[PDB]
């Protein structure tokens, strides 16, 4: 599960809403740990 | 991160070159569809 917001909330070009800033836990090298990763995704690759 | 403004990807085609290319295509289509047939081009409709 990703938690996402808009990358550029104040943008009026055709790119408004196209890039989302998503947060997720992922995995790490050791099975006991988790991390927090922030990354940008394109709207076309992410489903609500 | 985006190191500057967020801009949309795009492609440029010269208008005069395309207009001549398309006219040539129309002439070759007329050879199969008729000298007095109207040849219209339109964008793709359905699908992904």
């Amino acid at each position, epitope marked *: 599960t990703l938690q996402c917001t808009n990358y550029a*909330p*104040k943008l*009026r*070009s*055709m790119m408004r809403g196209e890039i989302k800033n998503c947060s997720f836990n992922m995995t790490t090298e050791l099975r006991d740990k988790k991390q927090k990763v922030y990354s940008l995704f394109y709207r076309l690759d992410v489903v609500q | 991160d985006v190191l500057g*403004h967020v801009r*949309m990807a*795009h492609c440029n085609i010269s208008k005069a070159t395309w207009n001549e290319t398309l006219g040539k295509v129309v002439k070759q289509l007329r050879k199969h569809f008729g000298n007095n047939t109207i040849i219209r081009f339109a964008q793709s409709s359905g699908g992904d």
Partner: antibody
Amino acid sequence: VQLQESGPGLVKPSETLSLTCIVSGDSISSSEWWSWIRQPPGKGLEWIGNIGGSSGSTYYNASLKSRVTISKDTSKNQFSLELKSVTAADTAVYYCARSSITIFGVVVLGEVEDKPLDVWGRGVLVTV
Amino acid sequence: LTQEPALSVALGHTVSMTCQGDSLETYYVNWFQQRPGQVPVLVVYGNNYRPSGIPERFSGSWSGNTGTLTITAAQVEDEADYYCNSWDSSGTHLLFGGGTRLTV
């Protein structure tokens, strides 16, 4: 670019006020918004309304809208504000101003930014 | 829009003037300065851009649903009313704060 304004100055209650904004060194037909702003001595800068310089589209202040008309004359590069039923609340300094649009990318893709009030005129003080 | 009615700072000290509203999620805060009796000017616009002619002391931030104008080491020439100006969410170009009275 410089902006200048003129008008009747003192009017009586229920009379209609007509203010004219003129420009120096510009052309109103550009893709810029032109606006009128009201500032009475005890308040801040309260927008009156605006008109698009290139298209004629207008917006108005909803509490004022029904009694205010804003128009532009492409000829002579001029704007005017027509305010009906002028009352004591209108004893304020009137300003004309222009917005501008900056460009960082492709114009046809909307890759522009707003700069809402780049140049201000000196304004005129009216009384009622 | 709501903003601090007044701020009092010693000469030579930095100030931070903050405005808040609902439309600031989608619009940038445009900071204006009006010295009493003078024509107002634009101080900060868009994505923290500075118009030519404004000293480097004036800068700001649009984080969250607020906007902040920071004047580093405020000078006597900066004594003016300051206003946080932005557009309304309906598209109407008016949403304007009461103004902050800055005394140095």
